[PDB]
Amino acid sequence: LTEMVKKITTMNRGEFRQITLAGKTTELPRSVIEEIGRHKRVLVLIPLRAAAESVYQYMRQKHPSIAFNLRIGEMKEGDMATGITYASYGYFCQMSQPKLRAAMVEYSFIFLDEYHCATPEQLAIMGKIHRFSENLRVVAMTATGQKHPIEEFIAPEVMKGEDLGSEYLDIAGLKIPVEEMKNNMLVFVPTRNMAVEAAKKLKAKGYNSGYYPSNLRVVTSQSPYVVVATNAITLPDLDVVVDTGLKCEKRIRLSPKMPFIVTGLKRMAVTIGEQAQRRGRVGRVKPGRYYRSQETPVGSKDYHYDLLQAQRYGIEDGINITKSFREMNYDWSLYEEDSLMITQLEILNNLLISEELPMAVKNIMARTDHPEPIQLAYNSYETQVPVLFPKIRNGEVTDTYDNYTFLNARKLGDDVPPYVYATEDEDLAVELLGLDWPDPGNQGTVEAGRALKQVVGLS
After folding, report:
1. Could you tell me if 229 and 211 are in contact, meaning their C-beta atoms sit under 8 angstroms apart?
2. Looking at the structure, do residues 171 and 291 belong to the same domain, yes or no?
3. 220 is in an annotated binding site
4. CA 95, CA 97: separation in Å to the nearest integer?
5. Per the UniProt annotation, where are the glycans attached?
6. Which residues contact 173 (CB under 8 A, 6 or more apart)?
7. Do 19 and 141 fall within a single domain?
8. Binding site annotation covers 21?
């Protein structure tokens, strides 16, 4: 739209704008560049590398009159490319704060696409560029298809040992009318284990069930079908959706007792948006039915675990990513905030960067397949030796261990390490084995804990 372009094109350096109107990532920057001029540099940040590639490919074909650039690999030295530059946020994560600023200042406009995804690279770049925001023109964009009526239902929860008539059946803990099994059903469940258990039970009852891609084609090719899936992106002639309203997602637990940081998957409610995408699977080609649990959706994505992961990208430059997030969010108002949480996270982020990271640790983090390398960085403040904790199966300690590369790790044994950062399954092992986590062993960790106690107190 013309008015929006006029508004963005008149922005002065140091200004920020938030847009919701869904052309977006394609037609909005295109219109802006045609207005500002073809030779002016315009940057469009996209979360996924493959997504950035897709747009670049599409746009260069569609508009030959405008120049397009793709930035998803290695750093282009002295990059001065003229058209619209489509880049991943991770592309800019490679650069030092001075280098990043030098690069960023050259673009006339910077477009932040799909900021609601809140990936660690995304959170780090937003916080980092905001540091020199006075020098930029930043535009944050978001998009926050039913052709037939959707009938909505609240399915009651099936109680343990409840005897449903010949009229109802258990669909992932929800009481669904049996007459619904004559239709094409999609069931949303939080876990992979539940998708398999729900599918296998329905198959045993005689239903054409499958779980979640080529091995679903055998199910979906015959109707009626029932497909049990976790949060996903074919499903022909879909009639009904059964939504558990739940998802499995990483979460953080902050405490003044060490380990101060505890992370892992936890079952939680989906967001309003997620629920809308789940209900949106029906009413597209024919009428639909949507059965939801009594579970209330949350308003927004919990970015805390990703914020903690983002902190890594500020280590080399000695930047506190949480402080940067907070300062940025104040000016830009993109995300909801939990002030106690951000405070705690900032106290720990100061610890993370309080000292130069040991070369040994720096080198392990670079090469390891370990899913949370930041754990190594935080723990370096107390220990240099990574510890292999026994794996938890069902709710019991086993003799299985995760084998991550380049760790030079040691088995837990009876020796609990002084971890600053632990996983839910590491903490569980400690408790199940009747062992205790050590208390802070140095001024740094001691004061960090004292500061944490203090905040939870004034909370």
Report:
1. yes
2. yes
3. no
4. 7
5. 320, 403
6. 157, 158, 244, 293
7. yes
8. yes
Exp. method: X-ray
Rounded Cα distance between 124 and 107, Å, is: 19
Helix (H, G, I), strand (E, B) or coil at 273: helix
Q: Is 7 annotated as a binding residue?
A: no
Does 24 appear as a known binding residue? yes
Closest by CA to 180, choosing from 188, 171, 172, 189, is 171
Is 405 marked as binding a ligand?
no
Which residues in 219-246 are b (16+ Cβ under 10 Å) and which e? Answer: bbeeeebbbbbbeeeebeebbbbbbbbb
Same domain, 90 and 74: yes
For this experimental structure, what is the resolution in angstroms?
2.8
Q: Which domain holds residue 119?
A: 1-145+301-337
Same domain for 296 and 308: no
Do the bridges between strand 261-269 and strand 246-254 make them parallel or antiparallel, or are there none, so unpaired? antiparallel
Cβ burial, residue 53 (10 Å; 0-12/13-18/19+): middle
Distance CA 397, CA 428 (A): 8
Token readout for 207 is 């239903």
The two tokens of residue 356 are: 């130069």
